[PDB]
Design a binder for these strands. Structure first.
Ligand SMILES: [Cu+2]
Ligand code: NA
Length: 327
DNA sequence: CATCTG
DNA sequence: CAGATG
């Protein structure tokens, strides 16, 4: 956690590049477990061999580690840090829709900065376009004061459309968060469950309303269940404009909302912690279900969930407030 | 994973 | 449809 960081840190840079700069998944994964494992290591490493004794730590890395030990750096690293292609690559990726693959490509072409992309827009896709348009907004986090407004809006319309819908902004916003990245929002409706063959309408139906009301600026992608799109909080008295924000929608069935309602809030650290206990109470969870465990190895069957409360008591737990969802 | 792209 | 992306 702090006694092996230089290294847990070096490797990590290495994995990202491998994953991004090269399309080296194999190598990438390689750094990946190796770090985290050195990461779990109780003592301070002072030799490459020391680590090599580890699982994941191969002679290559080993050597790498030594360089580090031997000198405050990694050349391959300082060499990476100053290559314009790689750096162009990593810059590029910042855009929405552009990814490693695209980067490389676009990099090949000679486009490497926010500047290039605008010239070469004809070659970007909607998402990519939208992504480049709101490079800045999308890079900034929404004040909960803003969260509170937007929601107020989601909720206002999600309702005016149909009394029966059950909106709910998930995330950190929920776990009290003063800032979020985007507004993610579970969606339900009684007439929406696990059996009931479809009903795309319910989703289209909202996405639509809000667009209609000028909340929703543009659509990233829109399916029969998910919904990725750009939105906006109406500027009041012209002098100040709201950043473009990234919003996501999702039509989940009744029979599995909270599952994903809780699941999605968090935390990453909490979910697991409750997940492990989920197990100790004769159960299992996943973003959608609180099943009972069969002793032969396994089995199942979705216990019926109607509150994030319901899931608690099942795994003999104190109903926790989304806040206390830190870990 | 659910969605877009070509 | 395989292959990106979020
Ligand atoms: Cu020790
Ligand atoms: Na090893």
């Amino acid at each position: 956690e702090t006694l092996n960081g230089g290294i847990t840190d070096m490797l990590t840079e290495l994995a990202n590049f491998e994953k991004n700069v090269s399309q080296a998944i194999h190598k990438y994964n390689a750094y990946r477990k190796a770090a985290s494992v050195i990461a779990k290591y109780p003592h301070k490493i002072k030799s490459g061999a020391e680590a090599k004794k580890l699982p994941g730590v191969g002679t290559k890395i080993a050597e790498k580690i030594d360089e580090f030990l031997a000198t405050g750096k990694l050349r391959k690293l300082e060499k990476i840090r100053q290559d314009d292609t790689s750096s162009s690559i990593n810059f590029l990726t910042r855009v929405s829709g552009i990814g490693p693959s695209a980067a490389r490509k676009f990099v090949d072409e000679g486009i490497k900065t926010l500047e290039d992309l605008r010239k070469n827009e004809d070659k970007l896709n909607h998402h990519q376009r939208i992504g480049l348009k709101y490079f800045g907004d999308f890079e900034k986090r929404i004040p909960r004061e803003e969260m509170l407004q937007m929601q107020d809006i989601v909720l206002n319309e999600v309702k005016k459309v149909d009394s029966e819908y059950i909106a709910t902004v998930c995330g950190s916003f929920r776990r009290g968060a003063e800032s979020s990245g985007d507004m993610d929002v579970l969606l339900t409706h009684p007439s929406f469950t696990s059996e009931s063959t479809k009903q795309p309408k319910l989703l289209h139906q909202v996405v639509e309303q809000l667009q209609k009301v000028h909340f929703i600026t543009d659509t990233l992608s829109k399916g029969e269940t998910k919904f990725m799109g750009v939105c906006q909080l109406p500027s009041k008295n012209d002098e100040k404009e709201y950043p473009h924000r990234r919003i996501d929608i999702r039509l989940i069935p009744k029979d599995q909302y909270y599952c994903g309602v809780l699941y999605f809030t968090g935390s990453d650290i909490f979910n697991k912690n409750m997940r492990a206990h989920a197990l100790e109470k004769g159960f299992t969870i996943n973003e959608y279900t609180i099943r009972p465990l069969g002793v032969t190895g396994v089995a199942g069957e979705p216990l019926p969930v109607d509150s994030e409360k319901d899931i608690f008591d099942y795994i003999q737990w104190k109903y926790r407030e989304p806040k206390d969802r830190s870990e």
